Amino acid sequence: GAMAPSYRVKRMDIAKNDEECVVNAANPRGLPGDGVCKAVYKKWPESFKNSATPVGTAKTVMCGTYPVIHAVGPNFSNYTESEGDRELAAAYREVAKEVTRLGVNSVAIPLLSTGVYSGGKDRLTQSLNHLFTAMDSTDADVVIYCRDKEWEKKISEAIQMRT
């Protein structure tokens, strides 16, 4: 584990991360997709071999020795708020199991279901709080990746508030 397990936020492309493994905001089919998924596909295309997995699950595939954890959050266009909330919490619980199993000391993670799977709603707080619920019991350094300047500030405020 990390000597003093921490949360940090970075506003940059998760394909450029400085961590021991990455979480992909994957689709269920293991397709190249859009947004974070497409960036992940460009950087680590070998990790898409048999990466298809259901909503609410995570499946790790190695790119060389570098683990890509494909985490499938729900598309809120299709799920009810209630069922989508359940599957989004479940996806993050499966990420925490994989990060523990891998024995990594750090992980790069995006906010699942916040972009094209958001169903047009701001889900920063919902998705970040499910991330915390799952990752708080892990000892990996967690680095959250985002692109929006206002989101970076809000994620940073949420991390510091708990410390």
Q: Where along the sequence are the contacts to Cl ion (CB under 5 A)?
A: 12-13, 115, 117, 146-148, 151
Measured between alpha carbons, how far is residue 105 from residues 1, 4, 83, 110, 140 in Å? 5, 10, 32, 17, 5
Say how many residues make up the chain. Answer: 163
Q: Which residues contact 127 (CB under 8 A, 6 or more apart)?
A: 73, 88, 111, 112, 113, 114
Q: Is 78 annotated as belonging to a binding site?
A: no
Beta carbon nearer to Cl ion, 67 or 73: 73
Does residue 26 sit in helix, strand or coil? coil
Q: Is 120 annotated as belonging to a binding site?
A: no
Query: DSSP per residue over 81-140, as a string?
Result: HHHHHHHHHHHHHHHHHHHHHHT-SEEEEE-TTSSTTSTTS--HHHHHHHHHHHHTT--S
Q: Is 116 annotated as belonging to a binding site?
A: yes
What are the tokens at 75?
Answer: 């598309």
Beta carbon nearer to Cl ion, 68 or 146: 146
Beta carbon nearer to Cl ion, 64 or 120: 120
Q: Is 27 annotated as belonging to a binding site?
A: yes
CB of 103 to Cl ion, least distance (A): 28
Q: Is 40 annotated as belonging to a binding site?
A: no
CB of 73 to Cl ion, least distance (A): 6
CB of 155 to Cl ion, least distance (A): 9
Beta carbon nearer to Cl ion, 32 or 115: 115
List binding-site positions. Answer: 13, 27, 35, 115-117
For the annotated binding site for ADP-D-ribose, the residues are 13, 27, 35, 115-117
